[PDB]
Amino acid sequence: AWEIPRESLRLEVKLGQGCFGEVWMGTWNGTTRVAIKTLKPGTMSPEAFLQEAQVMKKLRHEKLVQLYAVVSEEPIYIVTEYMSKGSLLDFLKGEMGKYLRLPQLVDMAAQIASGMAYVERMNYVHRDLRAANILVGENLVCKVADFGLARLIEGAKFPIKWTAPEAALYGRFTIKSDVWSFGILLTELTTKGRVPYPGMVNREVLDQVERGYRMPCPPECPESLHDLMCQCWRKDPEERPTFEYLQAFLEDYFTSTEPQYQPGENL
Ligand SMILES: N#CC[C@H](C1CCCC1)n1cc(-c2ncnc3[nH]ccc23)cn1
């Protein structure tokens, strides 16, 4: 019943293209502006492509990108709501980046924690939480997207710089490894989109994180916010905070934690 006829869709503008398929902005039933994830016909199994839609069928939250429809016969289409400002990573790196200060950045973080706390409640794992997988809409609304690797808890290698070591090394993906990634996401926000562990290659990152290395407090980031990051990067997955706590901490941040915050030059 999520099924629609393919002639119901008009693809128009390209927005991006991954190496397992493409993403277009389109029109649904001639009335609704949508986004249409397409498949590169041969890159990966059609059933592997559709599992992303399988997952999105079960999830529904204001801070997760919403599934609209599916075409499950080749060529395959996953149809979702359209996000007008593109990826958070591009937004932070773009011309808006320099004007964002801590209050807009923390509010973006709160929204992401809200969507993820919902994922937490439903017993899903995302497994690719990072700023390139968050989408920005009107009024600085942020929604988590790309549930390509997401699954209910019962590829070959993951971006180690965002992945909790137990998950990178032994495949132990839990909501607490998503919490690890959220901490790394917090450093992307507070540095306006810089790659984590500047100057370190993947192996060096792995070796040092095992030996206890953690990224320092970014310039102008408050120590209370870097404390939060460090709790997210606790070696013991179960010492890591929940998203429910993270959501509430970030929504209340400027009253309960940093009530005397003054804007600086970049944050
Ligand atoms: N690679 C490429 C995939 C791309 C990544 C960006 C966030 C999720 C993955 N992606 C963007 C979308 C999308 N969905 C809805 N509105 C949008 N606007 C711009 C991109 C976009 C879906 N996937």
Residue numbers in the entry: 259 to 412, 421 to 533
Sentences from the paper on this structure:
To see how cancer drug Ruxolitinib interacts with a kinase, we determined the X-ray structure of c-Src in complex with Ruxolitinib to a resolution of 2.26 Å. Each asymmetric unit contains two molecules of c-Src. There is well-defined electron density for Ruxolitinib in both c-Src molecules, which appears to be bound with full occupancy. Part of the activation loop (amino acids 412–423) exhibits no electron density, indicating this region is flexible. Ruxolitinib binds in the ATP-binding cavity of c-Src, with unambiguous electron density observed for the inhibitor. It is orientated such that the pyrrolopyrimidine rings point toward the hinge region, the cyclopentane ring points toward the C-lobe, while the propanenitrile group points toward the P-loop. The pyrrolopyrimidine rings form two hydrogen bonds with the main chain atoms of Met341, as well as a water-mediated interaction with Src gatekeeper residue Thr338. Besides the hydrogen bonds, Ruxolitinib also forms a number of van der Waals contacts with c-Src. In the c-Src/Ruxolitinib complex, Ruxolitinib only occupies the ATP-binding site, and c-Src adopts a DFG-in conformation. Based on these observations, Imatinib is a type II inhibitor for c-Src while Ruxolitinib is a type I inhibitor for c-Src. In the c-Src/Ruxolitinib complex, there is a sizeable cavity adjacent to Ruxolitinib in the ligand-binding pocket, especially between Ruxolitinib and the Helix αC of c-Src.
